[PDB]
Amino acid sequence: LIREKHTNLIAFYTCHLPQDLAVAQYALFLESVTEFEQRHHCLELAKEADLDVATITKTVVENIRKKDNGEFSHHDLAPALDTGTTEEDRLKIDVIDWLVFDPAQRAEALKQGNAIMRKFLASKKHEAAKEVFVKIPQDSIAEIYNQCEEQGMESPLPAEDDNAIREHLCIRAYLEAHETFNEWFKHMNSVPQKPALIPQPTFTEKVAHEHKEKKYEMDFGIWKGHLDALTADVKEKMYNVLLFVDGGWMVDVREDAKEDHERTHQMVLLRKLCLPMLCFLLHTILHSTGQYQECLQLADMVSSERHKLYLVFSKEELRKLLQKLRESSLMLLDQGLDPLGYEIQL
Amino acid sequence: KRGKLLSQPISQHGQLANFLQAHEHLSWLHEINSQELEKAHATLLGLANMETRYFAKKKTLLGLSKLAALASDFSEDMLQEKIEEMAEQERFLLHQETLPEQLLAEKQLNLSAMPVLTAPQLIGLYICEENRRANEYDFKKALDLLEYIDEEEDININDLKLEILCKALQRDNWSSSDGKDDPIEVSKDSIFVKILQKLLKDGIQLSEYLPEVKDLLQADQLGSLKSNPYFEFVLKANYEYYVQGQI
Numbered sequence: 045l046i047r048e049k050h051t052n053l054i055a056f057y058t059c060h061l062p063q064d065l066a067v068a069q070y071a072l073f074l075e076s077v078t079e080f081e082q083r084h085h086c087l088e089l090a091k092e093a094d095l096d097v098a099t100i101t102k103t104v105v106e107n108i109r110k111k112d113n114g115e116f117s118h119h120d121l122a123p124a125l126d127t128g129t130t131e132e133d134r135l136k137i138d139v140i141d142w143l144v145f146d147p148a149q150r151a152e153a154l155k156q157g158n159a160i161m162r163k164f165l166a167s168k169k170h171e172a173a174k175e176v177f178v179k180i181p182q183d184s185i186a187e188i189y190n191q192c193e194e195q196g197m198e199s200p201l202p203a204e205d206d207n208a209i210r211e212h213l214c215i216r217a218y219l220e221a222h223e224t225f226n227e228w229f230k231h232m233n234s235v236p237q238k239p240a241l242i243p244q245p246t247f248t249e250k251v252a253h254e255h256k257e258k259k260y261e262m263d264f265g266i267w268k269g270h271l272d273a274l275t276a277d278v279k280e281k282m283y284n285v286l287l288f289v290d291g292g293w294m295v296d297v298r299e300d301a302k303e304d305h306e307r308t309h310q311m312v313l314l315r316k317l318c319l320p321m322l323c324f325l326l327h328t329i330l331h332s333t334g335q336y337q338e339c340l341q342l343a344d345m346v347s348s349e350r351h352k353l354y355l356v357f358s359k360e361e362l363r364k365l366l367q368k369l370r371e372s373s374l375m376l377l378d379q380g381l382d383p384l385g386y387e388i389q390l
Numbered sequence: 391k392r393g394k395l396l397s398q399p400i401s402q403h404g405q406l407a408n409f410l411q412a413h414e415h416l417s418w419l420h421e422i423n424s425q426e427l428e429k430a431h432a433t434l435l436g437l438a439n440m441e442t443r444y445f446a447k448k449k450t451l452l453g454l455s456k457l458a459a460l461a462s463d464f465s466e467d468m469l470q471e472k473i474e475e476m477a478e479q480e481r482f483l484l485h486q487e488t489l490p491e492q493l494l495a496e497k498q499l500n501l502s503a504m505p506v507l508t509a510p511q512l513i514g515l516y517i518c519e520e521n522r523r524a525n526e527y528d529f530k531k532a533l534d535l536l537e538y539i540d541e542e543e544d545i546n547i548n549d550l551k552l553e554i555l556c557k558a559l560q561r562d563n564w565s566s567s568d569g570k571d572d573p574i575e576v577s578k579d580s581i582f583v584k585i586l587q588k589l590l591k592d593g594i595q596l597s598e599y600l601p602e603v604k605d606l607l608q609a610d611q612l613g614s615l616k617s618n619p620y621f622e623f624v625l626k627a628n629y630e631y632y633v634q635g636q637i
Contacts, residue, residue: 340450347453349480354460362461366422369454373419374393383415384447 046073050086055093067096071103074142087145101142101149105156108139109163116166116313129172136160137172140179148191150184151198155208161215162310166317170222177219185209203301211311214285214293218318221281225325228274232332236263275333282326286319292351293319320357327368331375337385339372392416396423418454427462431455431472438479442506445486452479482538485512485531496520509538510545517557526584529558533585552601556611558582564621573624574631586632596633603629 045054054073058066070090077083090097129137140160143153157180164173188205191197198204239256242249291297294311323342330339346353346365357365376385396419398406403424410417418433434455441448459472486507494501497520507515516524516532532554536547562580577583589596603626607616615621 341446343453343457344446344449347456349477354457359461362457366454366457366461370396370419370422377392383419384444384450386444386447 046076051082052089055086055089055095059093059095063096063099067099067103070095070100071107074100074104075107078138080141083141084145087142097146098149098152101145102152102156104142105139105152108136109156109159112163116309124168127168129169129175133164133169133172133175136163137175137179140176144179144181147187150181150187151191151202151205151208153180154184154188154212155204158208158211158215159307159310162307162314165215165218166310166314170219173215174219174223177215180212185212203298206298207296207301210291210297211294214288217281217284217288217293221278221285221322224274224278224281225329228271228278228329231267231270231274234267236260236267238264271333275329275335278329279326282322282329285322286326286345286353287351316356319353320361323353323357323365324368327365327372331368331372334375336372336375336379337381340369340376340384343369396420418458422458427458428464430458431462434458435476444502445483445504445506446502448506449483449487452476452483482509485509485535485538488531489515490521490523490528492523493518493521496522508543509535510543510550513550513554517554524561524581526581526588529554529561529581529585530588533589548601552606552609553611555582555601555606556609558585559612559615559621559625564615564618564624566620573620574627577624577628583628583632586628590632590636596636600629600633 045057050073054070058070061069074083074086077086087097087101090100137160140153140157143149143156157176161173161176164170164176188197188209192201237260239253239260242253245253285293294314296311323346327339327342330336330342342365345351346357346362354362373383377383380388382388395406395416403420406420407417407424407426410420414433415437418430418437421427421430421433432455434451438448438451438455441451456473456476459469459476464472483506487501489499489501489512493515497515513532513535515521516528516535521528533551536551536554539545539547559582562582567576586596589599607622607625610616
């Protein structure tokens, strides 16, 4: 019936099974549905048949989360290019719908949505992580409190979901710190080209160089007036992630939580993929705009006992950071300041 | 322009180091460039001890010294020694880092451009009139800063301790209530009682750590409170309650 495509039949032929088997076989059906109108219709046909719709949709999403027999290797740090959203990523973007059709699953949509975003962010698929972020409706953080004040949730505030809402807020702050960098980088590469000097030019060609340079003076003034603004925004977003509140970015707060070692390993890995990378981006943003003393204050941020970012770099990356810190330290000396950017008195 | 001092050939580094022994504020940049990171730790720590002109520069020198010690092949014992020797100077500088943004604004001070301050100077800021939000955390810092004063300052630590406690008692409103109310219940919102409750939680003997109730009442700093018999009673009742509560 799955292989002629189920309309109205399988649900009744599935409630004649124990719940473990009924859930598993109706999930094994819904794992084949890509047609959005048929998704809704074939959930209501299960809700007309006393089936466990909630463990069914969780089983569809978790089986699709589990189809990657891929361990988190450390060689794939490599500069892969153009790793955009494939059909095998879309079958994991177009799976969160199963927990969004019914409001009673917004918690699970966020718990599983985080797990698929953890995969895509580690896989450098930042747009695919943003496609999953857009599958989670923006009311969901309030709806998880609505579903706790009327009657009750897995606990009077769940220790899975307080940590999951905190993790979704970490993921949003990381996507803000990527989108603002992507637009800063698009804009930084747009730089107005200075009008070339013609050798031995006529009077007409000199006026037709003035009437190029006196446009470059405007174009470059506008372009820097946008660059310094984008350099403030991306710097808010990279500080919001590197200095993220108490516990810090992709760290929990509820020690009354249940163990997930898949989640905990992925979060401890993502802190080591993302936070060193953001520090190398932020140094490059500050240094390429001439903000050379803020490039050095990254050392106090990385060594800070509040955020302990020195625990998420390799020794080789702390050497790379001490090498980049010295790039700005030399540009301050070539500006006539001290090695840390202060006034030299004489 | 000096970047050129460091980009010299390795075959001259055994001359360069034996000349940078006359300029410590550049020697660490050649020590790191030689991977002699065990020197760079100590050079940047010496420079951090000498850098009093800029608070944010002393912090960056310790941040670089600590990132040399977290990159050198020190043994696990010497590495814990040089983590802890630096962690106490981070704890000291955290008292200057955590100065209230209103106290900094009212004194027109900038953390990026102000000098390093000594413990009596940090105490003197925290307890001042301009700290118009001073609380049981700032009046805890102002007592904990008494443990960062050397035996060669011409400064009686006990008279600082008296003046800190007097200025806590002058932030607390020792006016009388509407005649229905217990002064050992009402005192529990006072910052003076909240620092006693901190010292008790944090393990300290109030029977040995506090000045005498005779002489906290003979200190002149209290001014207008030194004529208030409700303050005279409530101070004694809370000293009696919190010191007898430890016997």
